[PDB]
Amino acid sequence: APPVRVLPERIHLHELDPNPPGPESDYRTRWEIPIGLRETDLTPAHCHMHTNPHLLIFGAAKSGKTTIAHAIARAICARNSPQQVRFMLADYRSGLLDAVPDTHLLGAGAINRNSASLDEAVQALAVNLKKRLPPTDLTTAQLRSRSWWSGFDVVLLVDDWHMIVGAAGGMPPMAPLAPLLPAAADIGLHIIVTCQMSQAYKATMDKFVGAAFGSGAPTMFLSGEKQEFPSSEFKVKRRPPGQAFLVSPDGKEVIQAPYIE
Ligand SMILES: Nc1ncnc2c1ncn2[C@@H]1O[C@H](COP(=O)(O)OP(=O)(O)OP(=O)(O)O)[C@@H](O)[C@H]1O
Ligand SMILES: [Mg+2]
Numbered sequence: 001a002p003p004v005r006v007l008p009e010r011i012h013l014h015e016l017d018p019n020p021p022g023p024e025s026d027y028r029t030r031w032e033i034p035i036g037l038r039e040t041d042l043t044p045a046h047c048h049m050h051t052n053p054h055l056l057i058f059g060a061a062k063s064g065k066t067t068i069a070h071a072i073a074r075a076i077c078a079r080n081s082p083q084q085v086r087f088m089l090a091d092y093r094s095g096l097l098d099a100v101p102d103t104h105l106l107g108a109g110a111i112n113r114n115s116a117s118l119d120e121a122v123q124a125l126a127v128n129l130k131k132r133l134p135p136t137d138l139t140t141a142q143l144r145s146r147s148w149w150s151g152f153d154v155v156l157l158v159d160d161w162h163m164i165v166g167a168a169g170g171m172p173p174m175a176p177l178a179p180l181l182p183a184a185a186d187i188g189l190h191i192i193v194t195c196q197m198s199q200a201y202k203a204t205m206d207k208f209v210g211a212a213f214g215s216g217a218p219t220m221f222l223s224g225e226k227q228e229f230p231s232s233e234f235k236v237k238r239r240p241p242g243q244a245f246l247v248s249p250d251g252k253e254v255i256q257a258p259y260i261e
Contacts, residue, residue, distance in 0.1 A: 007039040009240050013071040013258040016044055023081035030079040031153075035072060035218075036246065036255030045246060045255050047072075047218055052248070053190045054212040057257075058200035058229070059222030064242040064257060065194035066095045066159055068220070071258035072192065073099040073157055080104075083152060088125060090118050090158040092167070099157060106154065115167050126176035129154065132187035133180070146186060153188035161209055162199040174208040181211045197224030197236070220244035220257060 016037055021029045027050060034044035035055065047055050055072065059065045076085060077100060086106040089096055091113055105111070106125075112118040132149045142148060156177075158164070164173050172178065180187065191212055195203045203209040213219060221229070223239035230236065234252075235245045246255045 005042070007037065007042070007243065007254065007256045009256070010242065010259050011037050011256050013074055013260045016071075016258045017075050017078065020075065020078035022079065023084055025079070030084060031076075033072065033075055033079070034258075035075075035220075036244065036257040039254040039256070045253065048250075049190055051185070052216060052218065053184045053188075054215075054217035055190075055192045056209060056213055056217050056219040057192070057194040057222065057244075058197050058203075058219060058224065059194065059244075060197045060224045060228075062241060063197075063222040063224070063239070064259075065196075065222065066093070067260060068242065068257045069157060069159055069192060069194055070096060070099040071260040073155070074260060075258070076155060077101065077104050080153070085155060086110075086152045087155045087157055088112070088121060090156075090160075090164055092163045093160055096157065096159055115164075115173075118164065118173070122174055123176050125154065125156075126180060129177070129180055129187050129189060133183055134186050143186070146188070149187075151188070153190060156189065156191040156193075158191065158193040161193050161195040161203055165199070165203070165206070172207055178207040178211060181208070182215075197222070197228045200224075201229045216249045218246060218248035218250070220246055220255070222257075 017034050031049040033047040033049050035047050036045050038045050057065050082103045087100040087104050088106045089111045109121045112121050193209050204213045221234045222244045224236045226236050242257045
């Protein structure tokens with residue numbers, strides 16, 4: 001009678017990521033980010049952010065959204081120096097002060113806790129990021145190689161998308177950045193967005209989260225009520241905190257996302 005071992009209800013980031021490679025490594029190694037422990041083998045699943053730049057995290061109340069975003073930002077910072085990565089945060093509920101060490105923050109206005117701050121920061125970011133757009137001049141050998149510009153990748157770490165949408169009036173938030181999203185891989189842009197499950201369905205059809213979702217961004221479906229998001233592809237159901245059905249074009253599987261105090 002074989003011994004039972006199930007997906008543990010709490011896995012620390014150091015258990016998921018005991019041997020992180022460092023800034024010394026190449027781009028591919030620096031952006032192979034562990035995001036959780038698979039139920040099938042207690043082995044890390046990864047965000048291949050060197051190829052698909054984004055990650056979406058959907059979840060009901062107290063399902064672990066903020067902590068997971070914290071933990072994944074840490075795994076990214078373990079792999080990348082402040083010359084290789086910079087973080088801009090949307091943190092309306094003010095829970096991500098320590099998600100990133102102040103060495104890796106994108107300037108003095110990196111942490112935005114309200115609409116006025118975020119609008120200004122997103123304006124400045126889009127102006128800077130558009131400078132990295134690929135010319136039609138160059139050769140496709142330079143396209144995947146991203147050789148026409150050098151600098152840090154930008155991670156847009158966005159907690160509680162539903163609040164940003166609600167506090168934006170009727171205007172779309174991230175309007176300056178949404179047009180650049182098709183070129184995210186070419187300009188080194190990564191968005192990591194959490195959203196309450198009750199609004200995540202509406203979010204999958206907007207121009208920011210929906211652009212990443214419709215283009216195959218890996219998506220954690222944490223605990224939620226099936227009727228908030230009933231599409232049978234994803235198995236939206238009540239889950240322990242941190243447990244998620246991870247969906248990408250690369251497959252669908254149950255993971256335990258990392259915890260961090
Ligand atoms: N990866 C995880 N694994 C297990 N438990 C977790 C994990 N992350 C968070 N938790 C637990 O779940 C609780 C809620 O965590 P957290 O605030 O991150 O979720 P949330 O979705 O941001 O909640 P809120 O609805 O307040 O925004 C915490 O008390 C924490 O102990
Ligand atoms: Mg939260």
